[PDB]
């Protein structure tokens, strides 16, 4: 009950010559891969740890001004001088004031005034960077057996965890009774951490763009500082007042924490307290099913009554899960399972939990199956006591075709050209489609970086109109397509 009911679930079906399939794993999503003669497996990337960070810059979000002093010189006599202006801990500004016999020196006119204050930082946000070789992806592989999961949240016993790091290109996991699953992931073309800063402010962290983080208008330290006193642009965090050209004063702006929370609107929040472990992004992996085998194929079919302990439940993914219990003999046996029509003449549905088996009599078994749209009957057991459980799917093949088209379109909107890697059996059409997607997405990312979804909507509307009101039919079609894709991306962005 890990990948069932997650609502971000993709069924990868089949393998290629070579017994490998291409799957992109996302943190909040799940992948269920099915191939004929092979156990169904669930995949989930559950953790991404970045180790050995290097602080790139330390920004000040809250300061205090102390040790304020001011200096002035009489008009025409040049700039005033402050010793504090020697030290870069003091933020200084120069201005003019009206001077005269009343103000206290010889002549009348605009005198020079310099006010300085010691800048001290009370709260800073630290931006950290990691090297791609230092990333580490935790992937859980749980055989979709139907055996009731052991006590816990699948962290132990059933469900094997594999750590995918760029040091080794082949990750191997032994699933007892199923053989070995080989994954060749690519943790180098995932997030692209060379362009990313790990920004943490106050028990909160974000995965932010590096240039964006370097363009932040706040006082900063180099990151190699170790002194934390020589901030660069302190003038962003102070304001000097000369309301009437009478005297100059410097006050300190308030805490920038809320303004920075607003600035982080589109960044994705991560965890940086107990290690730099984040839960956003994907991981393209090549799944090798060469040494994967169905478990319990040497067992005989169960000759005994099955009772449905938990009533058939429709899953979010057009599949049904039924929990059954065994009362017969021959403890470890194959559950006789089928989805047929009323007359029990045709097989209408595919069993997702392939090769269901009751290991022990006491333990129930969760079977997942995918019934067809409409009436179907789930047959369970041999004729004496055989269960015949009716089911109605409540859908259409056209409906699921449109729904899967929408899911693929959304995947392209999220994964860019990495969408073509999803469930790809090394095809040639997929290769050409991915190359075209790479070129088109490069152009699109150049043309639309740093614009908002409202801006994308406006641009898409404008381009669609330009295409519609075009004399050239080819240019018309091109512009209308570009505008429609841009409108789709604007509607489906900012999430």
């Amino acid at each position: 009950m890990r990948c069932i009911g997650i609502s971000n679930r993709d069924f990868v079906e089949g393998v290629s010559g070579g017994s490998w399939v291409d799957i992109v794993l996302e943190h909040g999503s799940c992948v269920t891969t099915m191939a004929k003669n092979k156990p169904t497996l669930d995949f989930e990337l559950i953790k991404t740890e970045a180790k050995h960070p290097a602080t790139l810059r330390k920004y000040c979000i809250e300061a205090k001004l102390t040790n304020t002093t001011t200096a002035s010189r009489c008009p025409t006599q040049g700039e005033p001088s402050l010793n504090e202006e020697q030290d870069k801990r003091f933020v200084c500004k120069h201005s003019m004031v009206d001077r005269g016999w009343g103000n206290g020196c010889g002549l009348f006119g605009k005198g020079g005034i310099v006010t300085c204050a010691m800048f001290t930082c009370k709260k800073n946000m630290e931006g950290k960077i990691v090297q791609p070789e230092n990333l580490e992806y935790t992937i859980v592989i749980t055989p979709h057996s139907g055996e009731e999961n052991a006590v816990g949240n699948d962290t132990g016993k059933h469900g094997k965890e594999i750590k995918v790091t760029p040091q080794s290109s082949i990750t191997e996991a032994e699933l007892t009774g199923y053989g070995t699953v080989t994954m060749e992931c690519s943790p180098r073309t995932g997030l692209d951490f060379n362009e990313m800063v790990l920004l943490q402010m106050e028990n909160k962290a974000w995965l932010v763009h590096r240039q964006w983080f370097l363009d932040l208008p706040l006082p900063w330290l180099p990151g190699a500082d170790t002194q934390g006193s020589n901030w660069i642009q302190k003038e962003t965090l102070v304001t000097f007042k000369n309301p009437h050209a009478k005297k100059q004063d410097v006050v300190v702006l308030g805490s920038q924490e809320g303004a920075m929370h607003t600035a982080l609107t589109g960044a994705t929040e991560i965890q940086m307290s107990s290690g730099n472990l984040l839960f956003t992004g994907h991981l393209k992996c090549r799944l090798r099913m060469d040494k994967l085998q169905l478990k319990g194929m040497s067992y005989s079919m169960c000759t005994g009554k099955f009772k449905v302990v938990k009533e058939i439940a429709e899953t979010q993914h057009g599949t049904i899960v039924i929990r059954v219990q065994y009362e017969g003999d021959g403890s470890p046996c194959k559950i006789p399972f089928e989805i047929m029509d009323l007359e029990k003449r045709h097989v209408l549905g595919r069993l997702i939990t392939v090769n269901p088996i009751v290991t022990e009599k006491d333990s129930p078994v969760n079977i997942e199956a995918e019934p067809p749209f409409g009436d179907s009957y789930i047959i369970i057991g041999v004729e004496p006591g055989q269960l015949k459980l009716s089911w109605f799917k409540k859908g259409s093949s056209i409906g699921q075709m449109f729904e899967t088209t929408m899911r693929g379109a959304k995947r392209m909107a999220i994964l860019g050209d990495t969408a073509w890697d999803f469930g790809s059996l090394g095809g040639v059409f997929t290769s050409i489609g991915k190359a075209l997607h790479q070129v088109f997405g490069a152009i699109y990312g150049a043309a639309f970086s740093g614009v908002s979804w409202t801006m994308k909507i406006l641009i898409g509307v404008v381009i669609t109109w330009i295409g519609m009101n075009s004399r050239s039919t080819s240019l018309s079609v091109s512009l209308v397509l570009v505008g429609v894709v841009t409108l789709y991306l604007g509607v489906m962005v900012q999430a």
């Epitope: 006590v151 816990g152 949240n153 302990v309 938990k310 219990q325 006491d362």
Partner: antibody, heavy 119, light 110 residues
Amino acid sequence: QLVESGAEVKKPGSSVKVSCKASGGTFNNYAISWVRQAPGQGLEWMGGIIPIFGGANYAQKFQGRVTITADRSTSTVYMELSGLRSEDTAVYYCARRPQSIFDWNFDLWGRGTLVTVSS
Amino acid sequence: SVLTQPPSASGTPGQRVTISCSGSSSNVGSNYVYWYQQLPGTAPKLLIYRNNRRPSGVPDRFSGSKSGTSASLAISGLRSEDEADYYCATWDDSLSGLVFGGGTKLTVLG
């Protein structure tokens, strides 16, 4: 790692809010249920809570009279019992369970909290 | 709610004692059965979880048996320390709640 509030003598018709202080791990990963045992009697199951999801479920015998709540800020689970009577005199237990619909193995148990009801 | 357990049990050292608690199909047969041993003045302790599983640290003397609609906790190597009240816990769907057994008294001639 399950800490319960100290014993408190109540009066008939009053209310009592027993507190179960869970740890960081159990609050976000397990479920918690409240079991009361009358003096010299068998255990009884009152209700249960999954702290990150709330929506506690109660036994029919106590539905409408008890309320289980979780304070995610302090990682604490609360049991409030109203209309206290002599039948409500018993030690109250908060135990941890795997949070699955089918898992009801209370590996962790509290030290107990005694509630006294009398005129 | 029909889950019944023998109110008391008697046994001698090194003499297996079976505490069989029955119930309805939904009550016991249709769900796991948990056995807890509760020494006086102490919180109940998990003995057998699911049907015949012993938690880590629980000695092997205790074993869990589950029949079609009844379950029995077997006590091998009976000892004075084992004397306690025993219950079997099982979720039952008709009542939509956890039902505890009435408990059994381990009256041991120690």
